[PDB]
Amino acid sequence: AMGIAARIASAQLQGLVRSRRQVVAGPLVGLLHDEDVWFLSRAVAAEPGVPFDPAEVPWALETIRKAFAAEDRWLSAELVEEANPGLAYVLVEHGMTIVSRPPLLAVEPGDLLVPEFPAGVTAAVVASAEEQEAANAIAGDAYETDASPFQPEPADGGAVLIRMDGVPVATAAWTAIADGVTEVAGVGTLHSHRRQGLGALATAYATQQAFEVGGATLAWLTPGDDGADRIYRRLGYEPKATAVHLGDPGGHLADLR
């Protein structure tokens, strides 16, 4: 309960519920967005860090499935294994499929390292709708299910652009803070500027802003979603937990990563 995995899972829930209706059923909570975009609605653990009773899971899952079906939505679930050990396996037993177990990497302010910027390379926090549009366009083809539309309060999220000779070429974003926790996501670089360290700069600078102006005390991310094998360790990030991404049969199962 006092651990980093539970802290991250709890903060994720706290963030998600600000814009989603809850269907709480025992150890699970279904979260339904106003929009039908599939990944905006999902289930997560209702009580990170608290033991669960596996006997409740079949009824809980059917309750949530019913709520999703009423909206013609397909169910996926995201867990943190260490926050609710064994829960994913009970979900699999009752019809879900684990598609991936991505690592959750984390860093605290005193451990973050922002690399030196090469010649011509600068950074700026996103400060307009048009800069946010550029950020979304740069990151756009990357897998992203967790700063958009632009809003001015860094505690409520934000993004950064890395520029080369004044032109945006890379980006990263941070989510609204919850319990001092932010997720860094939306990392990308233009194809023309890949493999030059610019995604790592973006990640580092976004993390730094989340801490300096956003009020975050912990940042986490999951890697590889932009297809780049950059080494987040150079920035101070370290593996701290294991995410588990599950999908129901049919629907968007093939799209889940």
Side-chain angles (χ1 to χ4, degrees):
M2 293 304 94
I4 191 172
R7 183 180 174 198
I8 289 171
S10 289
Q12 185 187 257
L13 178 57
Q14 185 182 341
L16 288 165
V17 299
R18 298 174 175 138
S19 63
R20 296 165 183 82
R21 177 170 65 86
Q22 298 174 51
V23 178
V24 177
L28 302 175
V29 55
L31 299 165
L32 287 159
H33 198 276
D34 288 350
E35 299 181 1
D36 296 300
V37 175
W38 70 266
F39 58 78
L40 297 180
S41 298
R42 68 177 63 128
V44 304
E47 299 174 21
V50 179
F52 73 96
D53 185 343
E56 293 178 2
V57 173
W59 159 82
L61 187 58
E62 294 303 314
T63 298
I64 295 164
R65 285 172 171 153
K66 184 163 71 179
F68 273 59
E71 301 298 339
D72 271 324
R73 292 181 193 172
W74 174 82
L75 181 66
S76 58
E78 292 194 359
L79 304 174
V80 180
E81 176 64 30
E82 300 86 353
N84 295 94
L87 181 56
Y89 282 143
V90 184
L91 294 176
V92 171
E93 181 188 18
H94 299 292
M96 304 200 83
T97 299
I98 295 167
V99 171
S100 65
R101 288 177 291 170
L104 300 195
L105 310 184
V107 70
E108 290 188 314
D111 293 329
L112 179 64
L113 306 166
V114 180
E116 175 174 4
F117 279 44
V121 183
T122 63
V125 72
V126 165
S128 71
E130 296 76 18
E131 287 164 23
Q132 186 60 50
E133 292 168 354
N136 291 346
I138 297 163
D141 59 334
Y143 185 85
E144 225 233 333
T145 57
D146 282 1
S148 188
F150 176 69
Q151 60 75 35
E153 174 49 52
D156 295 346
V160 307
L161 292 172
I162 302 298
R163 310 112 59 76
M164 178 66 83
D165 297 323
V167 176
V169 299
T171 189
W174 69 96
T175 65
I177 282 59
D179 180 48
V181 185
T182 190
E183 183 189 1
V184 173
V187 182
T189 81
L190 288 179
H191 186 72
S192 58
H193 290 82
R194 68 197 189 283
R195 298 175 15 91
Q196 296 182 32
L198 302 169
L201 295 183
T203 302
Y205 189 70
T207 306
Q208 184 182 60
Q209 299 311 301
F211 293 155
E212 289 186 355
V213 296
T217 64
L218 180 65
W220 67 275
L221 60 82
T222 191
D225 288 336
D226 52 355
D229 73 0
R230 63 181 72 91
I231 297 167
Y232 292 98
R233 184 153 208 275
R234 299 200 176 99
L235 310 184
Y237 277 92
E238 298 178 68
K240 289 289 176 181
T242 310
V244 190
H245 293 185
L246 306 98
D248 259 10
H252 285 280
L253 183 62
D255 299 308
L256 188 59
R257 297 287 182 279

